């Protein structure tokens, strides 16, 4: 397999470091998938009563 971890970057691209430089160095291992986990959190809520 050219992408062992299943991400858009091959084994060489990851191991060689020739990828986006904002990726953690964890994901330079062919086994650790370059993978973002994004979540959202609400902080406050406003109500506009339209009478």
């Amino acid at each position: 397999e050219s992408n062992t971890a299943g991400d858009p970057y091959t084994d060489y691209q990851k191991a060689s470091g020739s990828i986006d430089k904002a990726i953690k160095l964890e994901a330079r291992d062919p086994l650790v998938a370059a993978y973002p986990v994004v979540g959202v959190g609400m902080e406050n809520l406003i109500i506009s009563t339209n009478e």
Binding site: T49, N50, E51
Partner: protein, 51 residues
């Protein structure tokens, strides 16, 4: 027998408002560049924070 002649006048002033869209905001802004490169098609995203 009776005849009555009446004459009237009236004046009214009202004032309505919606309480979900009570006003409109207009901000006068200006963009600043303090880096080393020009930026074409500048498109800022801003927050309007009130208290």
């Amino acid at each position: 027998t009776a005849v009555q002649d009446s004459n009237g006048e009236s004046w009214n002033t009202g004032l309505s408002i919606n309480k979900g869209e009570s006003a409109y905001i207009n901000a006068n802004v200006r963009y600043y560049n303090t880096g080393t490169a020009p930026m074409y098609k500048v498109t800022p995203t801003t927050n309007l924070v009130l208290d």
